[model samples]
Target chain A: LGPLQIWQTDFTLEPRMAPRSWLAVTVDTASSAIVVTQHGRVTSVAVQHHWATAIAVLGRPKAIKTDNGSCFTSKSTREWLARWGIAHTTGIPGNSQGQAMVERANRLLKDRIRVLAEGDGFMKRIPTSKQGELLAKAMYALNHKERTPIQKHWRPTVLTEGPPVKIRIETGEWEKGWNVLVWGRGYAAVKNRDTDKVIWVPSRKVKPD
Target chain B: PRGLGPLQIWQTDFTLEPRMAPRSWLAVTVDTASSAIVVTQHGRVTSVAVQHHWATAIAVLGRPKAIKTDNGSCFTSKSTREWLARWGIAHTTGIPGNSQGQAMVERANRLLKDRIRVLAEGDGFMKRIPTSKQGELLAKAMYALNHKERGENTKTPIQKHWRPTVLTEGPPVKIRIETGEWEKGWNVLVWGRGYAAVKNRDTDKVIWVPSRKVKPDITQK
Candidate 1:
């Protein structure tokens, strides 16, 4: 995939804080580049504003993928994207795989924000004043920082019969499975033994069987 | 420190630079066998913060057998002791005023911070690097350190084992910590979080303790 080919947009709530706020994120599925804007309320206007900001700086994405959240499904949100010559696609309700890129980015940024907030001595919830700054810093770090390569020599683990394993789905909930398979970078191929349903989970989202 | 299995032992220490906030600090953990290192930044140097770092590390690298640390309050606090005990990890500390006990990790802390500074300065930061930026840079720097070739064998630490070999069931033994010892006990059952149902050899009373405290009784030798 190339830059601006497809962008995924989503909103994630702050992990823990009073005066609940939300983060509107537009992530470039291609490069994993992200643009984040904080909001006190979830509204179509706010969603459009976040995209406008991202487009103004990062250029208009050819298309976008989003979940069926009210903000994304609103008529105003669709009409606005159509007017901007940006294609819009809504993911199936309850399915996160289509919007996986943005969801994962949200989790990554939020986790960093938590760490930064904690580093600043905020234990319970991130201070309101510090929210924007921490979010920006987390975004910048994720975009610009180099990371250690995932290690390969972790004691090789194997899955055997009858042990219960856990897999994380799109909603950030872990689902127990009858079997699991581990692969490069720790990705998981989880299977339901009886129904034969399978789901591929990214690394950091799976547990040993 | 040599010829040991991965995660068999970890050496930890705290480091502070001039630019770090008074309460802000960096904690480093190095595996003695492979010299693998984990560098984490924290707001405060407390037992809770230390636990956070180790938890993150364990999630990625699997549980370590024992942790070696300097005698800082954070490493020796009651909560830390109980935490390590619950995980069945031995907690060893270096002698006071003498840094040699954890020289390996001390050197690791210096080297890790050195690289972090280089990365920060390269990013056009001269004054104290912002806490957020330092957090980012430290993570990046660890990758380089873990993969960098060193030692006589000239292999990167990442090449070492990621998961420590765990013993599920074992024979009766003595247990030792920095300040005390359990003369004898048998690892009757192994449970999660490194805990084990240990039956006292002398008293015949079973008590729950960390598996790290269980050592083969070699006094008869």
Candidate 2:
């Protein structure tokens, strides 16, 4: 239950600029503390670099969990983890639940990056001139700052008819869905794969899909 | 063509002084309806600066129905478009090689620069304006420019009472005859002028598109 026991790792594409650039994120499953965060190409070598960075700072974790991406399941990754005696675990190919923690971290990380990048006048281009400095600041803020989650319920429900959206559930994790209906403040009705019933969820958690 | 009333259309332009501190960008917004003007000083011209000055003006004059600007990188950036869309303001740009379209804002920019130059000279500035003195200089010039007597009397331009209502949400719209064959009839969520988010009804995948490509799906009925 302590920090760094099981580190969840994943990659998220840098949304606005620099096509193919990806952010590699890792977090502690128990503490929910971010262990490593770096933006670069998604590759086995990049993964090794991230592990090296994380291990150097906090020491090696007992185990690491990642999705079944080729970069994570590659021979180089397995061999590297084996040498360190750290167990490498991969989630089932199609399911998202097992590695949900890291996915949540990715969302939160991108949100912070967008805010900070916008304020700093570096949002127009990816790989911002001060990428390292900005990432460090964002990571520090996420790791140390006491942030109140956004609470304003201002978006009009009529806006929900345009596109599908991702909804945040009870676990603070997001699920993709379409046909959103904003029934009240802080809540909405969304239909996932199941056509039988609609799921009610927090409106604040509803994001553009 | 001119707008019928105040807050209907606002024009923006930037006066750049490369040799000055804060890089000396004087951003100005002129309301076509009332001829009222808003001005701010910045070190650099960027989407962030554009939004900052626009927000300052919005706080005072209220949001305008449409914002017309030249095709500067600051005004055309994705972040700028997204910001304007989220605020429900329409963004329009002059056609390439069509200088007359932005003549009003360009003239306002020139007049602002002339006033600022005269004020700077009167203030005994040696060469370049200092960063600390830029805002003070800008404010004094803006006050003199706005308070001048004009148009048959001592009447001064000011924010008018007119504001256009914006719909934050609406029915599903479709991108008019654009994109992949499978993309037709896809419902689009309009974010702002020329910006929207659309979803693949079949795959459930979503992507943002230019709202110019979309139109209300009236045929759905």
Interface Cα RMSD of candidate 1: 16.1
Q: What TM-score would chain A of each candidate receive against the reference chain A?
A: 0.65, 0.63
Q: Please, what are the lDDT tens digits per residue for candidate 1 over residues B186-211? A: 43322222334455556766565555
Candidate 2's TM-score reads 0.37
Best by lDDT: 1
Q: TM-score (chain A) of candidate 2?
A: 0.63
Every model: iRMSD: 16.1, 19.2
Instruction: Estimate the Cα RMSD of every predicted model relative to the unseen true structure.
Output: 16.6, 22.0
Candidate 2's displacement at residue B204, Å, is: 47
lDDT of each: 0.63, 0.61
Worst 10 residues of 1 chain A by lDDT: A148-157
Give stretches of model 2 more than 4 Å off.
A1-209, B18-20, B96-98, B150-153, B159-221
- Model 1 fnat value: 0.03
**Cα deviation of B166, candidate 2, in Å:** 22
